Amino acid sequence: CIFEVKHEGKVMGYACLVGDKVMKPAHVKGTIDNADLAKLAFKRSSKYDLECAQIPVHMKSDASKFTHEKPEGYYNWHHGAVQYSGGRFTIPTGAGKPGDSGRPIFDNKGRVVAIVLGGANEGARTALSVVTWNKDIVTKITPEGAEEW
């Protein structure tokens, strides 16, 4: 379900097969490192900083079902455990660097909860700037002073 966006042979962010679309943050430079995915036609959406397309039939079995459901507590991401509370995702400062955009923040059942875009350093912890689902629609939470990763 997770695929990596490469730019000049360098991983910039990620792409994800959620629902029946193929997502990847709009701000991420590069092209999905997967033939089938790379040749697709994406529809950009600057409001959501999202850029979706449709999953080829032969990969649709590979999608992951997202969720608006996110109760205060700890979430999972590649570098460790993210913490959600006060309507804000945070992590120990240093555990997220430029080149981590696109990486999903899963919950314990695998549902993608948000997609990292960058983070604002506020000391001990960094408030993440993410793309998250609302009641049904996409949204973007960007803490004051975020540094786009």
Residue ranges that bind its own copies, judged by CB under 8 A: 8-10, 35-36, 38-39
- Cβ atoms < 10 Å from Cβ of 54: 14
Q: Which is nearer to its own copies, 34 or 121 (CB)?
A: 34
Q: Is 27 a catalytic site residue?
A: yes
Side chain identity at residue 99, one-letter code:
G
Q: Is 49 a catalytic site residue?
A: yes
Q: Which is nearer to its own copies, 23 or 37 (CB)?
A: 37
CA 23, CA 2: separation in Å to the nearest integer? 10
Q: Kindly name the residue from 7, 33, 45, 49 that is annotated as catalytic.
A: 49
Q: Kindly name the residue from 100, 101, 107, 129 that is annotated as catalytic.
A: 101
Rounded to the nearest whole angstrom, what is the least distance from the CB of residue 28 to its own copies in the complex? Answer: 18
Q: Which is nearer to its own copies, 10 or 60 (CB)?
A: 10
Rounded to the nearest whole angstrom, what is the least distance from the CB of residue 116 to its own copies in the complex? Answer: 24
Rounded to the nearest whole angstrom, what is the least distance from the CB of residue 96 to its own copies in the complex? Answer: 22
Residue 55 phi/psi, 5° resolution?
-70, 125
Identify whether the C-beta of residue 16 lies closer than 8 Å to the C-beta of residue 112.
yes
Q: Which is nearer to its own copies, 31 or 83 (CB)?
A: 31
What HEC string does 32-91 produce? Answer: ECCHHHHCCCCEEECCCCEEEEECCHHHHHHCECCCCCCCCEEEEECCEEEEEECCEEEE
């910039």: which residue's tokens? 12
Rounded to the nearest whole angstrom, what is the least distance from the CB of residue 133 to its own copies in the complex? Answer: 31
Active site (catalytic) residues: 27, 49, 101
